[PDB]
Structure 1
Amino acid sequence: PIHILAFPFPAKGHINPLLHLCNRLASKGFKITLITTVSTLKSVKTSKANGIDIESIPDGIPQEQNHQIITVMEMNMELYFKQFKASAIENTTKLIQKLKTKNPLPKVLIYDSSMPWILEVAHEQGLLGASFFTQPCSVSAIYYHMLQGTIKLMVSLPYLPLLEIKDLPGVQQFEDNSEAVAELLADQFSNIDDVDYVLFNTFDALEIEVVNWMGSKWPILTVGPTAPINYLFETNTEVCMKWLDQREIDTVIYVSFGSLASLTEEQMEQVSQALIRSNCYFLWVVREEEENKLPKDFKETTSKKKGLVINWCPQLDVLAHKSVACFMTHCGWNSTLEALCSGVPMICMPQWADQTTNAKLIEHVWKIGVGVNKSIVKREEIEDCIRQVIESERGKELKRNAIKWKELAKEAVSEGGSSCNNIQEFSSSLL
């Protein structure tokens, strides 16, 4: 087989979409080796069934308590991102030299677009280099314009809806790290003319005009949704799926703020009371390190009548379940795309980075969600949005719109669709 190496940035919203692409490629007969940091490997619980070799490299930055890589970087982003970079260059080089003593020899390196300097490692080692963007073309376009100096972080940009300042990617939320974060996002386009393959986790029908614009500059390959062995981490699948099976169609609010975002105890109390007073059934992912910010007795007693509070769920299987009526989300791109491709309308509560822009696209372009208004977002505001989605006639339109996007996404990934064709073109190029 042809041997593909894959190197995501060490965070679940970067690992998971690349894993799903790797599983598709392994189904076409390619051998896959996934490169992870030691810190990521500590959370990996299931890997045997997917058949992919996993090889680890050092973190390259300090190990603090049981914190994850981004959390450590936030202490000093400019210093620690560039320590992570130097270590990753050195140690991926060493790893590839070891892989070159085994058959089949590696031929291509698919690397996260946020790590553009890995291209030079691939080429130095005689491999093709493929940059994998884990955000949509519309948001990535903003980072390109930042690199060109057309904008620096109402705002008009080519082939994007008119934006309010609050809709631009949220870099101000990173405080003293804000300048470093803006620079790394723009750097995704710094060597794009040297990349052998440019891949985006999106599909053409979702953003026709900006994809066409981007394609007038570089040959890009839209391959999304990569999401269809589907999980590396503990998902509590049996508990979650048995509980959803006890629920009637269209009755459950799924709630998750992703793998990184953390809300204050003040904000968590507002969400807790909004869910209780709504009187709907709900499944709320509260990560284990965030549980201590919940109101006392919430997980053990008051959520027992109508809710399931869990530290991680099988999100693809949850969003596919007929009981789920809507998705209160932080609007990370994977959650946004997974919900749209499942036909599930959203309540948008973005926190930072691309989430703010994603929420504007959800509400105003794709029209499959409503957005909360900050005062802190209060229980009444959240309750209002729940009634809009679950009860009102507007909620029925949002659901019809979500089902339309689900059908276009099914088309894109099936035989003859744009993403299916693009993955075939990538695969045949390697052959």
Structure 2
Amino acid sequence: GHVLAVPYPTQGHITPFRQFCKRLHFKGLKTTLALTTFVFNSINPDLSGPISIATISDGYDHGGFETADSIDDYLKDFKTSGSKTIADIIQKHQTSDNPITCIVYDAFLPWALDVAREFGLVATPFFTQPCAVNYVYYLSYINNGSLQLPIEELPFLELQDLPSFFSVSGSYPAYFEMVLQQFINFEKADFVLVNSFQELELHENELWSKACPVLTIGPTIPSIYLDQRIKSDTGYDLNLFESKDDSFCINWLDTRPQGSVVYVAFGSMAQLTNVQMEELASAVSNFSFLWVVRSSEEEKLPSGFLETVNKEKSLVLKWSPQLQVLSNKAIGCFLTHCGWNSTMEALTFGVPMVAMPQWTDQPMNAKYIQDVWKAGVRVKTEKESGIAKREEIEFSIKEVMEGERSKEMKKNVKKWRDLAVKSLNEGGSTDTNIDTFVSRVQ
């Protein structure tokens, strides 16, 4: 058995795809990971497991996404160039020790099924977003692109709870058509994989599994932090942002008392405005903080803000070893844009969050953080503008550090570590679902 693994070319999709492959290798399955050449020349390959990489093309080997004329051009070029480049990996390996038997492609790339079917291969999409989010999208697809509020099977959800495509009308029309066209052919899939575990959205997994065979194979957080069954899986080893020489960071955090630091980070792709950046900077400077401002975003922090940094309470970085930060006892709360990987990381580490979602599926994750998992609070935004003002930010941070919702939320969230380990340990639902997939593949 041999699996070709095709992530969407961003950090948030690549690392679950890699981590999943480490589990496949642990279970005796050969995997080749298909990176775009733009990405492959942007990686800095320090590994934490055996890795086999094949290169494919999205049609932007030189400049990547930012050189495309439009988002919708990128997707269609990606389909054309990606279909050819993926086919060639399959062809080339046919006469080899292990010809490929299964394509595990990102759900954002449904055309990979066509390629998988043309070579008689097993095909399974891989959803990097939670069951709740995708079931919402699925219900729109079997509709014709909009949704019945309230959702009869999940009626506690409102307009501000939905993905940004619904509440910001007309925004990202091409990206909106992508998340819906995840379902154009998923019927024909041999299985459907989602980077979640059953006990985290037990309800919403059921709803979605009525329509399609869903196999939860998360969480994709490295084995060392949970189940420890995979000795080599110590961290995230395919990173698009250079690694700071990260022990400066983790040494600084063992300097500070337990639960004293506020961690701030917005993922790999989210861009705030100048206005957004000073409201944050003021609210956060009321605290001992660790803030990740990526390099493309230093522009928009206040004039001379990085000088005014109190070096005895707080620190600003271009990027961070987020896994090790969230495992560090000096963190008190995590101010997060609610990217799915970041949310599952904070839940697994028992770090309560201040949710400050920005777009696509982050509003849903923020609702579940506050009202389903009761593991954090959503910051309030002025409705004219969608911007969180410095005092609404500071209010929310204090509610998770000092309020006494704060020690209730503190204990509600520590439930999840042990649930996640149980699913990754022998006989867990995730460990069982991975075995069903491995069974099919050979």
Percent identity between matched residues is 44
In the alignment, which of 307, 313, 319 is matched to residue 314 of structure 2?
307
Shift in alpha-carbon separation, 1:132–1:178, aligned structure 2, 3 A: same
Tell me which of 387, 396, 403 is aligned to 2:414.
Answer: 403
How far did 1:62 drift? 8.0
1:122 counterpart residue number: 116
Q: What are the superposed Cα offsets for residues 236-266 of structure 1, whole Å, 9 maximum, x if unpaired?
A: 3212211112122111111111111100111
Summarize the alignment of residues 362-377 of structure 1 with structure 2, pairs less than 5 Å apart: 362-375=369-382, 376-377=387-388
- Aligned runs of 1:221-370 on 2, under 5 Å? 221-228=215-222, 230-233=236-239, 234-236=242-244, 237-277=246-286, 280-370=287-377
CA distance in 2, matches of 1:415, 1:235: 33
Q: Residue 38 of structure 1 aligns with which residue?
A: 37
| Structure 2: stretches of 5+ with no match in the other structure | 223-234
The 2-side partners of 1:174 and 1:123 are apart by 37
Q: CA deviation at 1:96?
A: 1.8
C-alpha distance after superposition, 1:299-329 (max 9, x if no partner)? 3442423212111111111111111111100
The one-letter code of the counterpart of 1:379 is: R
Residue-by-residue CA offset, 1:329-377 (whole Å, 9 max, x unaligned)? 0011111111111111110111111011111111111111101111221
Identify, as 1 or 2, the structure richer in helix.
Answer: 1
**Alpha-carbon offset, residue 72 of structure 1:** 4.9
Secondary structure, in 3 states, of the residue corresponding to 1:426?
helix
Deviations 1:91-138 (A, max 9, x none): 111222222243222111111011111011012122211111001111
1:102-113 matches, within 5 Å, as 102-113=96-107
1:137 to 121, 131, 139: 131
Q: Which residue matches 1:212? A: 206
Amino acid at match of 1:53: S
The corresponding residue for 1:21 is 20
> Structure 1 unaligned runs (5+)?
none
Q: CA deviation at 1:430?
A: 2.2
What secondary structure sits across from 2:263 in the alignment? Answer: strand
**Structure 1 pair 305/297, CA: closer, same or farther in 2 (3 Å)?**
farther
Cα deviation, 1:201-240, whole Å, max 9, x if unaligned, reads 1111111122122223322211110212522123332122
- Structure 1 position 197 matched with structure 2 position 191: yes
- The one of 152, 174, 187 aligned to 2:181: 187
Structure 1 residues 43, 299: closer, same or farther in 2, change over 3 A?
Answer: farther
Distance 1:136 1:149 in 2: 20
For residues 105 and 67 of structure 2, the distance between their equivalents in structure 1, rounded to whole angstroms, comes to: 22
CA distance in 2, matches of 1:401, 1:106: 44
CA pair 50-155 structure 1, distance change in 2 beyond 3 A: same
CA contact (8 A) 2:47 2:237 kept: no
Which secondary structure state, in structure 2, belongs to the residue aligned with residue 408 of structure 1?
Answer: helix
**For the aligned residues, what is the CA RMSD?**
2.0
The one-character-per-residue Cα deviations of 1:244-296 (angstroms, maximum 9, x if unpaired) are 1212211111111111110011111111111112xx32111111111121123
Structure 1 SS opposite 2:126: strand
| Whole-angstrom CA distance in 2 between matches of 1:239 and 1:307 | 13
Question: Deviation string for 1:391-417 (max 9, x for gaps)?
Answer: 111111111111012222222222221
Q: Which residue of 1 aligns with 2:229?
A: none
The residue identity in structure 2 corresponding to 1:356 is: P
1:419 and 2:430 matched: yes
Cα 1:43–1:283, aligned 2, differ >3 Å: closer, same or farther? farther
Indicate which of 85, 91, 104 corresponds to 1:91.
Answer: 85
Of 138, 162, 166 in structure 1, the residue corresponding to residue 160 of structure 2 is: 166
Aligned positions, number: 423
Equivalent-residue separation in structure 2 for 1:6 and 1:170 (angstroms): 28
Distance verdict in 2 for CA 1:167–1:173, change over 3 Å: closer
Contact in 1 for aligned 2:83/2:112 (Cα 8 Å)? yes
Question: 1:306 is paired with a residue of what secondary structure?
Answer: coil
- Conserved 8 A contact 1:254-1:328: yes
Q: Give SS of 1:55's match.
A: strand
2: distance between equivalents of 1:367 and 1:154?
26
Match of 2:230 in 1: none
Question: Contact 1:329–1:350 (CA<8 Å) still a contact in 2?
Answer: yes
